Design a binder for this molecule. Structure first.
Ligand SMILES: *[C@H](CCCCCC(=O)O)[C@H](C)N
Ligand SMILES: *[C@H](CCCCCC(=O)O)[C@H](C)N
Lengths: 325, 325
């Protein structure tokens, strides 16, 4: 009885999430939705077919068993049996994840939701929905990506050695392999550039983008970003959000990671000695793998909590993710 | 309402565990026991007084409010209100932790137990007690030290990026500051030397020890050890125990850590790329801090699970520890 799961969003992240699920024996992808269509197959999605439909014909509604629809998310919820969904949605507008969650609250569907949100303020909009989620019978796992997520959890574990936390420093690197199937979401990173914000970045043209990325050989270096690692670690009682600082480099013109992603956790131990733990990711673990891997680990953990009748909102920092086989 | 906790064992580890609890506001040490005596103080232990009694007069039963007893563990259980205990016991004989747990099962006391066991086979003896523990109303957290524990949990998190795990390699270093208050437990490490075993190591004299440690300037280099990280990660469905290999260096003649403790997690991602995550501990995080810190993090996590009516046996690999303030 493998977990029947769905993906909402079929840009680069959701496509990678679909590929990641293929060989799992204990997780079965039955449901995808994009803006313009949805695909359900209780016997398991043809990812080849769905990625074809999307990239060639603009939506998975064009897939062999696909349905076109401007209510894809509303239609797919009531369409068949899905234990959990990964919300691989961009947060555009900044309310969209919260709005999609309100559709899930409103639908009377129960089960597990996971996101890979990045921005403190989007995670806050989901905090306000804590009781709504509980009451609806939904276990919601928020910030269960790479950062927040994998790295947030690593810091939460690392923190146990210390009487007091001083700094959680996250430095991430990202190399874009395929420009096509990232330039849909590149504006989420441009929004973290100094001078910019989501509204300004989202209104930019392919031209205004390429004109910016030309200034640096396709390198976005983003400094002290709005990253929900800060509140997740604070709700877990580890440190104040202000002691969490997140920074990153994306190389748009190189598949190779421009630096080793890591989290440095600094604190003082009970003996009054000050020291740092360091969790480093392999350079050949892609963004897709470091996001979607934890995402479905959390989805499985979420189902464990859901099954025991534990509902509400959980962060990467609160629960141990479960290896999906 | 801080958690009322106890320590069983007052060698080096339990003494450090007591010091670690002092400044906590949300955890109150009310109970210690050694072989020959016990100390209870519902208003909070005088650690200065207890460490004095133990080191100077041979037992904490000699402490200001102490009681001498050859049934210290049996007497302290029924003595007052304790939410959880850290079993800072050496596993000597190899059944002792399991035997103490049977006293706890038998006592009809309910709450949280945590250990920092090291040996796969001792952790197995506690697996056999799974239902006994559940039925008794006890949440038992096993292998919640440094390794197994902190490092086991780190690997469990790290594993999420990968379709398949190849190797979990743990390399640990330990520098002994105070020879006095380690030579009580040094024989647990000597047992991992090649030729040796617990029975042979435990029968050794201060002389036979010093004659061994003289051969290497006080350096035990222990290779492919029996370490319960292997079964904990297997029960968590991450990998086979045979893909977990644990090795270490203790420098008996230097407080300074003889190498950086770390865990290397190697696997293949869904894209077929092979890579390693690396979790490294600060050189100035002591053994005491890397053991007792996670131990009480797990004790708190254990109370969270206990409070929700979740009983049975949990490993470091199964649950997120909770920062104790
Ligand atoms: C979010 C950060 C991507 C995570 C990097 C993880 C890794 O090292 O693979 C992006 C900037 N949208
Ligand atoms: C168990 C290993 C001690 C853990 C080392 C952790 C660190 O780096 O502080 C000993 C060998 N009894």
């Amino acid at each position: 009885a493998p977990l029947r799961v769905g993906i909402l969003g079929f840009g680069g992240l959701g496509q990678a999430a679909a590929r990641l699920l293929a060989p799992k024996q204990e997780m079965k992808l039955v449901a995808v939705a994009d803006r313009h269509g949805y695909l359900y197959d209780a016997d398991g999605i043809d990812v080849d077919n769905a990625v074809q439909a999307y990239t060639q014909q603009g939506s998975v509604g064009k897939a062999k068993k696909g349905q076109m629809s401007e209510q894809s998310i509303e239609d797919l919820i009531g369409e068949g049996e899905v234990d959990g969904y990964f919300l691989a949605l961009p947060n555009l507008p900044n309310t969209f994840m919260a709005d999609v969650t309100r559709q899930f609250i409103a639908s009377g569907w129960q089960g597990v939701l996971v996101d890979a949100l990045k921005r403190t303020s989007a995670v806050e909009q989901l905090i306000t929905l804590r009781e709504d989620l509980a009451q609806a019978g939904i276990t919601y796992m928020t910030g269960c990506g790479a950062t927040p997520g994998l790295l947030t959890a690593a810091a939460a574990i690392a923190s146990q050695s210390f009487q007091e936390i001083h700094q959680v420093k996250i430095t991430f690197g990202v190399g874009i392999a395929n420009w096509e199937a990232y330039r849909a979401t590149i504006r989420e990173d441009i929004a973290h550039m100094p001078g910019y914000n989501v509204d300004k970045a989202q209104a930019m043209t392919d031209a205004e983008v390429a004109a910016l990325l030309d200034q640096t050989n396709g390198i976005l270096a983003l400094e002290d970003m709005e990253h929900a690692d800060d509140i997740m670690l604070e709700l877990a009682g580890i440190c104040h959000r202000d002691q969490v600082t997140v920074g990153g480099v994306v190389d748009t013109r190189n598949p190779k990671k421009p630096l080793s992603t890591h989290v440095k956790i600094t604190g003082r131990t009970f003996e009054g000695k000050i020291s740092s733990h360091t969790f480093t990711l392999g350079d050949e673990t892609s963004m897709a793998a470091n996001v979607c891997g934890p995402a479905f680990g959390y989805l499985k953990a979420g189902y464990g909590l859901h099954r025991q009748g534990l509902k509400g909102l959980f962060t990467a920092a609160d629960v141990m993710p479960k290896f999906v086989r």
